[PDB]
């Protein structure tokens, strides 16, 4: 296994923040999450797709990373980059953001 997250990072209100994650096995789809809500999906065969709850302020970042624009005090919390791989299974990583 391999779990290499960006770490517990912080940014100011109004600005933007980049969420990085790095994984040995074929990556089928990477799911981004704001605590329990789904932020985005990066499917290997179908590409990047943003949730209707975040199309207005979330754009695909570099590689399999994400960019959360127009920050607010409510965006503080856990963030998860789920890696659904084959045959290794699912690998998850945690990232805490403060604002």
């Amino acid at each position, epitope marked *: 296994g391999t779990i290499e997250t960006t770490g517990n990072i912080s940014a100011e209100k109004g600005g933007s923040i980049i969420l990085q994650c790095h994984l040995t096995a074929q990556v*089928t*789809q990477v*799911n981004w999450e704001q605590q329990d*809500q*789904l932020l985005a*999906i990066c*499917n290997a065969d*179908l590409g*990047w*797709h*943003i*949730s*209707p*709850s975040f*199309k*207005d302020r979330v754009a695909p970042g570099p590689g399999l990373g994400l960019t959360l624009q127009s920050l607010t005090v409510n965006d503080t919390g856990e963030y998860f980059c*789920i890696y*659904h791989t084959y045959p290794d299974g*699912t690998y998850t990583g945690r990232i805490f953001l403060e604002v």
Partner: antibody, heavy 126, light 114 residues
């Protein structure tokens, strides 16, 4: 084509819970190209989205702010159906409740409601 | 939330004549990355659920006749019926599927002048 059959009682006493089911035929509940939504309609509020359940590589749920804390939409993979549970029902919840399929083929997280159930008239009265 | 509005509350048109109904979103439903308008049109006949007519602002759904068509873009949308038939009498709604919550317009009742 996809067929959606609705079931569950229409009459609900105030404060008690409304529970309806939407049985699917012609598609799966865990489909990556679909989301399973509940919409309501009344002459006072028109058409209003209530919530949805979708499985991409994990089960997810998104609900309207006007019902968060009362609403629950859970799938059943073995029975190929999705439920609606509205707790603490008030006379304002009286509406025709429709279950519908959101066709998310091009954009996997967004699409129009291409198929709808017959509708269930829900009356809130003692 | 995106508020959807429809300019004609009701419209009465003679049999075989054109009927155009307008729709407007408070924000643009055009997503740049794929150049798609997240807007749909529905027809609801009395006592039955709404039927999808158009999606992506201009794409006709399978099985819906050629007389129904969608145009307009970004924020202002227009559903047209080139020749209104007797069976086309219904309330027609527009909806945005761009941001949560997905919202519908107030509806436009299309009726026949005879």
């Amino acid at each position: 084509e996809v067929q959606l059959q609705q079931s569950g009682p229409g009459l609900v006493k105030p404060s008690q819970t409304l529970s309806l089911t939407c049985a699917i035929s012609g598609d799966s509940v865990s489909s990556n190209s679909a989301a399973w939504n509940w919409i309501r309609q009344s002459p006072s509020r028109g058409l209003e989205w209530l919530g949805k359940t979708y499985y991409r590589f994990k089960w997810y749920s998104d609900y309207a702010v006007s019902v968060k804390g009362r609403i629950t939409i859970n799938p059943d993979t073995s029975k190929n159906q999705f439920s609606l549970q509205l707790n603490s029902v008030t006379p304002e919840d009286t509406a025709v409740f429709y279950c519908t399929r959101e066709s998310t083929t091009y954009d996997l997280l967004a699409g129009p409601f291409d198929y709808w159930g017959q509708g269930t008239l829900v009356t809130v009265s003692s | 939330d995106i508020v959807m509005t429809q300019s004609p509350d009701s419209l009465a048109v003679s049999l075989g004549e054109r009927a155009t109904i307008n729709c407007k979103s408070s924000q643009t439903v055009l997503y740049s990355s794929n150049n798609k308008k997240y807007l749909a049109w529905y027809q609801q006949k009395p006592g039955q659920p709404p039927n999808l007519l158009i999606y992506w602002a201009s794409t006709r759904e399978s099985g819906v006749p050629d007389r129904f068509s969608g145009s307009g873009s970004g924020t202002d949308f227009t559903l047209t019926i080139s020749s209104l038939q007797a069976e086309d009498v219904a309330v027609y709604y527009c909806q945005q599927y761009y941001s949560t919550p997905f919202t519908f317009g107030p509806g436009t009742k299309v009726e026949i002048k005879r």
